[PDB]
Each structure stands twice: as C-alpha cells, then as structure tokens.
Amino acid sequence: YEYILVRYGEMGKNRSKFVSTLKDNVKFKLKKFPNIKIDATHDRMYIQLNGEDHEAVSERLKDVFGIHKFNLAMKVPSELEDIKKGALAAFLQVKGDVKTFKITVHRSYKHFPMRTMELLPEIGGHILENTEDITVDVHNPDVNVRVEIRSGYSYIMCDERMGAGGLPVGVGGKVMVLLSGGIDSPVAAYLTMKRGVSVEAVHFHSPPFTSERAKQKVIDLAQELTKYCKRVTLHLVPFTEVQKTINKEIPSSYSMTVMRRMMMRITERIAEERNALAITTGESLGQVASQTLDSMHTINEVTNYPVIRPLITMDKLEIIKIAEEIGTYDISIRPYKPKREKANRFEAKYDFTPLIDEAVANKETMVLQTVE
Amino acid sequence: YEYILVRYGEMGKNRSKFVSTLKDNVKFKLKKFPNIKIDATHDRMYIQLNGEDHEAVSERLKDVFGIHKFNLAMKVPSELEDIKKGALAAFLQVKGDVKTFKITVHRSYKHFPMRTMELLPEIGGHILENTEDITVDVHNPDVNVRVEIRSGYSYIMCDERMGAGGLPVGVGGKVMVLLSGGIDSPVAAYLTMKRGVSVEAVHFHSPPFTSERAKQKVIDLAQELTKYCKRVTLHLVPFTEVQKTINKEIPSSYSMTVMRRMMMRITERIAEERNALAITTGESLGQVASQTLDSMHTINEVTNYPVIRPLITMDKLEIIKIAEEIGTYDISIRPYKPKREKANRFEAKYDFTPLIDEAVANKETMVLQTVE
Ligand SMILES: Nc1ncnc2c1ncn2[C@@H]1O[C@H](COP(=O)(O)O)[C@@H](O)[C@H]1O
Numbered sequence: 218y219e220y221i222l223v224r225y226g227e228m229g230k231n232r233s234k235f236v237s238t239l240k241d242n243v244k245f246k247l248k249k250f251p252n253i254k255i256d257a258t259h260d261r262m263y264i265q266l267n268g269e270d271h272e273a274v275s276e277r278l279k280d281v282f283g284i285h286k287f288n289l290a291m292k293v294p295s296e297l298e299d300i301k302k303g304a305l306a307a308f309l310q311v312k313g314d315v316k317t318f319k320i321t322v323h324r325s326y327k328h329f330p331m332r333t334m335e336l337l338p339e340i341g342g343h344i345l346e347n348t349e350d351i352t353v354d355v356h357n358p359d360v361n362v363r364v365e366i367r368s369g370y371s372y373i374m375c376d377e378r379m380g381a382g383g384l385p386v387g388v389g390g391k392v393m394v395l396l397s398g399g400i401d402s403p404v405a406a407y408l409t410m411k412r413g414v415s416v417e418a419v420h421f422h423s424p425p426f427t428s429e430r431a432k433q434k435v436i437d438l439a440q441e442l443t444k445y446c447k448r449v450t451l452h453l454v455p456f457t458e459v460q461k462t463i464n465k466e467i468p469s470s471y472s473m474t475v476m477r478r479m480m481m482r483i484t485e486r487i488a489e490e491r492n493a494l495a496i497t498t499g500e501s502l503g504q505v506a507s508q509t510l511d512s513m514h515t516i517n518e519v520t521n522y523p524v525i526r527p528l529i530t531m532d533k534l535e536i537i538k539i540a541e542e543i544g545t546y547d548i549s550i551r552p553y554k555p556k557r558e559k560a561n562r563f564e565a566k567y568d569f570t571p572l573i574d575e576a577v578a579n580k581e582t583m584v585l586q587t588v589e
Numbered sequence: 590y591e592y593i594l595v596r597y598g599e600m601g602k603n604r605s606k607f608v609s610t611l612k613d614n615v616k617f618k619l620k621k622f623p624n625i626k627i628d629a630t631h632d633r634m635y636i637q638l639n640g641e642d643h644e645a646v647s648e649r650l651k652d653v654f655g656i657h658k659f660n661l662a663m664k665v666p667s668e669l670e671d672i673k674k675g676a677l678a679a680f681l682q683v684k685g686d687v688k689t690f691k692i693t694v695h696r697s698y699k700h701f702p703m704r705t706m707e708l709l710p711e712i713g714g715h716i717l718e719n720t721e722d723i724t725v726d727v728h729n730p731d732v733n734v735r736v737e738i739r740s741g742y743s744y745i746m747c748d749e750r751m752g753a754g755g756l757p758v759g760v761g762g763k764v765m766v767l768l769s770g771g772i773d774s775p776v777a778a779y780l781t782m783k784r785g786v787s788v789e790a791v792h793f794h795s796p797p798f799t800s801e802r803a804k805q806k807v808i809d810l811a812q813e814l815t816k817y818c819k820r821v822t823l824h825l826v827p828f829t830e831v832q833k834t835i836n837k838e839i840p841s842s843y844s845m846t847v848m849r850r851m852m853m854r855i856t857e858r859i860a861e862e863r864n865a866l867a868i869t870t871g872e873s874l875g876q877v878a879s880q881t882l883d884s885m886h887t888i889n890e891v892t893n894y895p896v897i898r899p900l901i902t903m904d905k906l907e908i909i910k911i912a913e914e915i916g917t918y919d920i921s922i923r924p925y926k927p928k929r930e931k932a933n934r935f936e937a938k939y940d941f942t943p944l945i946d947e948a949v950a951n952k953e954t955m956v957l958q959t960v961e
C-alpha cells in the first residue's frame with residue numbers, strides 16, 4: 218500500500234548499467250502515475266507510491282522486462298508498535314479467501330532490541346485480536362506476513378507477484394529486427410527484447426503490388442510490441458524498384474534468393490546507420506514455409522553481422538503459443554537449393570549498389586508507443 | 590503385437606527424402622532386432638515385428654526424431670471373425686488398470702460388407718464374452734479399441750505412444766556444431782538434430798594446458814548425443830600452437846577475441862571439407878558467462894556462414910531443463926567491448942594462415958555410436 222519493492226532478475230559497472238536501464242524503463246511505464254518516487258539501489262528497487270493506486274501500478278509493472286518479482290510493502294518506523302500496525306495493514310490489503318496466516322521475520326538490523334523468537338507471538342497476537350474468523354498455520358498458511366527489520370524503517374509484505382523476467386530492455390545493446398506480417402517475426406522481436414536487447418524494426422514493402430492492409434499489419438505488430446519496451450522504431454523500406462530490377466536482371470529461379478540477399482544488404486546498411494550490432498529474423502529450420510539450409514547459406518553470404526535467429530530450432534506450436542501469449546497472433550493471422558556460385562554469377566550482371574543506397578536513403582521511420 | 594505403425598511428424602520429392610531418411614534412422618536403431626521388416630509409404634511406416642519383442646522395439650523407437658506417434662497393431666485378414674479376434678488380442682496386450690473399453694471404427698475399405706453401425710456391437714460383444722469384470726464406456730473408456738478396415742487386411746490397436754517428434758535426422762542437411770564442456774553446447778547440438786539437421790561436432794582443445802579429463806567430457810557429451818541419431822562424428826582440433834602464438838602476437842585485452850575468431854575461421858574451413866552449410870554454437874544472450882553483443886559482433890566478422898544459435902534467447906533454466914532431460918547435464922557439470930577495427934589491426938601484425946591450415950590438417954576424427 219505504501220511501497221512496491223522490485224527484486225531484480227540476475228546480473229560493478231554491469232549492475233549500474235542494469236539498474237539505471239531498469240529505472241528508466243519502469244519510470245517510462247509508470248509516468249502516468251506522477252506522484253511515485255523511485256529509488257533503485259544495486260540490490261533492490263523501491264517504488265514509493267505516495268497515494269497512487271498500487272493495483273494500477275502493479276498491472277503495468279508486470280510487463281516490464283528485468284523484474285523477477287515484486288512486493289506491495291508497508292514502510293513503517295522500526296519499533297514493535299509501528300511494526301505491529303504495518304503488519305495488520307499489509308494483511309488487510311489481501312483480497313481473496315483469507316482464513317489463515319503465518320509470520321516470518323528477517324532481521325537485517327542486528328541491534329534491534331527484541332529477538333525474532335519474541336517478535337513472532339507479538340505480531341501474530343496483534344493481527345489475531347484485530348480480525349474476526351482467522352487463525353495461524355505454520356504449515357499451510359493463506360497469507361504469509363513477512364517482516365524485514367532494518368534500522369529506522371522496516372518493511373512488511375504479504376503480496377508477492379511474479380514479474381516478466383528477462384533483462385531490462387536496452388542493457389544488452391541494439392539490433393535491427395526484420396519484421397514481416399507472419400506469425401514468426403514479431404515473436405522473434407519479443408524474445409530479443411526479453412534478453413535485454415532493444416530492437417528497431419525493419420520492414421520491406423513494395424507499395425504498388427503489396428497492399429496497404431499488409432503494411433498496416435506490420436504497423437499493428439510493431440504497435441503491439443510497445444507493451445514490452447519504451448518505444449518501437451519502425452523503418453519502412455520501399456522495395457518496389459529493387460523488386461522490379463530483380464525481375465528484369467535476374468533469372469527467375471534465383472529472383473527470391475537475390476531479393477532476400479538485397480534485403481540483408483540494405484538491412485546491414487541501416488544497422489550501421491543506427492549503431493545496431495546485429496540483425497534479428499524469425500527464420501526457423503524445417504517448417505513447410507521455412508527456408509532450407511541451402512537457402513539460408515546462400516543468403517547469409519552477403520553479411521558477416523550476427524544474425525540472431527530466436528526461433529531457429531523452435532516448432533510451429535511453441536511459436537504460436539508465444540504469439541498468442543504476447544497478443545500478436547491474431548494480427549499476424551490477417552490474410553494478406555540455391556548455390557552461392559550462381560547467386561554471385563547472376564548478380565554480377567547488374568550493379569545493385571545505387572538501388573541499395575537509395576532504398577536506405579528512402580526508408581521512412583515511425584516511432585510507436587503504448588497509447589495508455 | 591504383430592505390427593508397429595508409425596505416424597510421421599509433418600512434411601513430392603520432399604516426402605521421399607523424409608520417408609527414406611526416417612526409414613534408414615529407424616532401421617539403424619532397430620538393427621539388433623533383425624527379424625523386423627519395415628515398409629515406409631508416403632503416409633505411414635509399417636514395422637512388421639515377426640515375433641520381436643514389441644516393448645523392446647517401442648523403447649528404442651521413442652527416441653527417433655521424425656516420429657509423431659506410433660501404435661502397436663494387429664494385422665488381421667478382413668472379415669468380421671478375424672477382426673473380432675484381432676480386437677481381443679490387441680485389447681489383452683494392455684497392461685495397467687483395465688476395467689472399461691470403447692470401440693471406434695474407421696472404414697477406409699468402402700466395399701466392406703457390414704456397416705460401422707453393425708460392427709460396433711459385434712466387436713464389443715466378442716471382447717465382452719471373453720473377459721471377466723469388464724464393461725463398455727462411450728464417455729470415459731480405459732482402453733480405446735480402434736479398428737482400421739482396409740481391403741484384404743485390417744489393423745486393430747489400443748496402445749498409442751508418443752514419439753520424439755521433430756524431423757528425421759539428416760533430412761535438413763548437415764552443420765558443424767562447436768562442442769565444449771559446458772551445459773550449453775550439447776543442448777544446442779540436440780536442438781539442431783531435432784529439426785532434422787545432422788551435426789558433426791568440432792572441439793578445440795589445447796593438450797598441454799587443458800586436461801585429458803576435459804577432453805573426456807566432450808567425448809562423453811558426444812557419446813551421449815548418439816542416443817538421438819545414427820552416429821556422432823567428433824573432430825578434435827589441436828589448438829595449443831594457435832593459442833601460444835596469440836599470447837605472443839596479440840595484445841592481451843584481445844587475445845580471447847582473436848582466439849574465438851581463429852576458432853571460427855578453422856571451423857569454417859572444416860565445414861567446407863565436410864560439406865556442412867552452417868555452424869551451430871551454444872551461445873546465448875545476456876547470461877553472466879555469455880558474451881556481449883559487441884563480442885559476438887566482432888567474432889562473427891570472419892565468417893558469413895550461417896551461425897545457428899538455438900539458445901540465443903533462452904534463459905539458463907530452460908537450457909538446464911533440457912540438458913537434464915537429454916542427460917548431458919551431469920556430464921557438463923564435471924568441474925574442469927571488442928571492436929572490429931582493433932581486432933583487425935592486431936591480427937594484421939602476424940599471418941595466422943599457416944596456423945589455421947595446419948590446425949585443419951591436424952584435426953582428429955572419432956565416430957561415436959550408441960553401444961547397445
Ligand atoms: N517484407 C519483409 N520485411 C522485413 N522482413 C521480412 C520480410 N519478409 C521476411 N522478412 C524476414 O525474414 C524472415 C524469414 O522470411 P520467410 O522465410 O520469407 O518467412 C521473417 O521472419 C522476417 O524476419
């Protein structure tokens with residue numbers, strides 16, 4: 218009711234970069250709760266509520282990567298009486314079938330006048346004589362009342378919620394994610410972010426002979442991903458001229474291979490511009506619509522940038538499960554052996570460099586946020 | 590008791606390559622059951638048992654990638670009487686608390702004299718008057734007795750077992766997997782195989798100042814992986830001289846970066862020799878012992894071969910879970926920001942090409958099998 222105490226996932230200078238990234242991301246997520254103050258130490262993040270609805274704050278906190286668990290806590294002055302009080306207040310904030318309880322005491326303030334042995338019956342007694350049909354269970358308690366005793370101030374909590382886990386978005390760096398309208402790529406973007414890497418999305422569209430409705434899918438997908446980070450930058454690359462030239466200059470059996478090669482070349486040029494160190498795709502091995510190893514081998518020739526492939530060894534079912542969980546599935550669902558020698562030999566016949574450079578120069582950038 | 594009918598995972602020329610790969614892998618797995626005959630059509634694989642212990646065959650069948658499910662079946666001639674018989678025999682082969690049953694009839698042979706409507710009470714009646722304390726349930730049956738009626742011969746089955754899933758090892762091609770003694774790399778090798786890609790393992794060891802016990806770990810890990818494919822080819826590359834030269838020629842802050850770059854260069858040279866189209870690693874993002882994106886970005890400079898990274902966005906817990914499931918965990922457990930400009934500038938100072946070529950020439954190859 219007074220505080221939310223967030224416990225970090227897992228991590229010197231590495232912790233600083235972790236904490237301050239988490240701070241900024243949490244701050245941004247809760248900015249529509251302007252009364253809150255946040256102190257983030259190297260071991261714990263303290264969210265001072267100052268009247269702000271703890272439930273409302275909780276519902277937004279659970280979507281932030283980098284948080285293992287968090288607790289709704291009471292911060293009370295550190296003598297027995299103020300401790301007794303805070304325990305009760307914390308206890309009463311627990312909705313649901315509440316019939317039994319337990320008290321647990323961590324004593325970090327070693328010079329506290331009373332012993333844990335003695336504190337137990339005291340706090341229990343105070344909750345007992347201030348409730349109605351409620352007893353204690355040491356073995357099967359409904360509500361665990363945990364008392365952390367520190368000097369000056371002490372925390373009481375009963376309400377432990379799971380966080381999203383993973384790593385604060387931004388701590389690991391930045392990659393470009395190749396986003397398309399299928400089920401896969403948004404999932405891959407999501408998994409990248411969960412490991413603390415922020416993503417900028419890159420989408421190739423060919424405005425005449427691809428529809429606006431298909432472009433809206435990608436925008437909608439990028440919009441949905443805003444739930445998991447501060448903002449999603451979406452680069453829309455006009456691909457139509459490159460697509461046309463490939464049809465004219467390249468033998469048909471290789472047109473798709475070269476187009477994907479051209480996609481990767483352009484994406485690398487964007488990655489450099491944006492100081493991104495890798496490129497994410499939703500490629501996976503061995504599905505009907507998934508490319509062969511031969512295809513992958515031939516397309517990857519054009520870049521020695523890491524190509525992060527989160528779904529590389531995942532099956533359709535686990536991919537769909539996640540897409541459903543994160544809520545990109547129903548948007549995605551809207552219904553709209555190559556060799557290196559030959560790929561090179563065909564590309565030798567026309568200089569795609571001006572096309573590549575213009576496509577980079579012509580990209581449009583949207584910046585999406587969760588619109589509260 | 591007479592047959593095992595395997596149902597395929599999921600997949601023209603693509604099915605042929607799938608079926609015959611599965612056939613060869615199953616054949617190899619069951620070669621110590623020499624009486625068995627295997628017919629594999631494009632829709633089903635039939636294993637004629639010919640007296641061979643079906644349980645023993647089942648226990649080895651469940652570890653073969655490419656099998657969704659399989660059934661212990663009876664193949665009986667296709668008139669009512671031989672059908673009644675086979676149903677009972679199939680039913681009686683079911684160990685466990687058997688008290689109720691049900692009959693289900695798929696009628697693929699359209700010109701079969703009797704209708705499903707009539708077949709139901711007949712087969713049920715025959716099992717009823719030939720068992721003791723057993724009735725039928727249409728809603729909550731212990732044993733489902735499924736009758737597939739075809740011309741000439743018909744199948745009865747009650748015993749549906751799950752298979753390993755994934756894709757027949759070999760169907761997708763071949764990659765080199767970089768294998769080390771940690772928890773990760775064997776898991777990555779395993780996940781690669783489950784998507785139907787066979788792996789050849791590559792391990793760098795530096796015989797004087799790495800132990801034989803550490804090399805035995807990798808051998809043990811490769812041995813354990815033989816459970817999931819026909820054989821594991823393990824390449825042991827002597828790395829000591831390259832390691833020494835790096836210590837002498839390279840500034841210390843970059844020695845590890847260059848060593849890994851040298852590893853990747855050698856591995857690519859081996860991949861080519863072995864007609865492998867990619868390289869698998871157990872790299873993941875954002876664990877304490879995992880490399881940074883900067884590190885990954887700088888090491889990947891030296892190869893434009895696909896680098897398959899199955900665990901790239903997995904956490905420690907899911908990695909450990911799998912390593913435990915596949916039984917590599919307890920072997921692994923045995924206790925034994927770089928920039929491209931600087932990496933290149935330092936490597937410019939000494940020609941590592943002769944070292945790279947000799948290491949490739951000096952690799953030793955072991956071939957491991959599951960030793961029944
Ligand atoms: N039009 C596109 N724009 C951006 N990325 C794409 C596009 N098409 C495909 N991709 C990326 O390439 C991956 C594999 O392509 P595919 O095998 O054609 O589904 C997808 O998961 C996307 O990450």
Ligand SMILES: Nc1ncnc2c1ncn2[C@@H]1O[C@H](COP(=O)(O)O)[C@@H](O)[C@H]1O
Pocket residue numbers: 766767768769771773774791792793794869870871872878879880
């Ligand atoms: N000595 C080695 N031999 C072969 N592969 C290795 C070796 N050391 C590391 N690797 C590979 O590189 C990956 C990441 O290395 P690391 O970040 O050092 O654990 C491991 O998962 C292995 O696939």
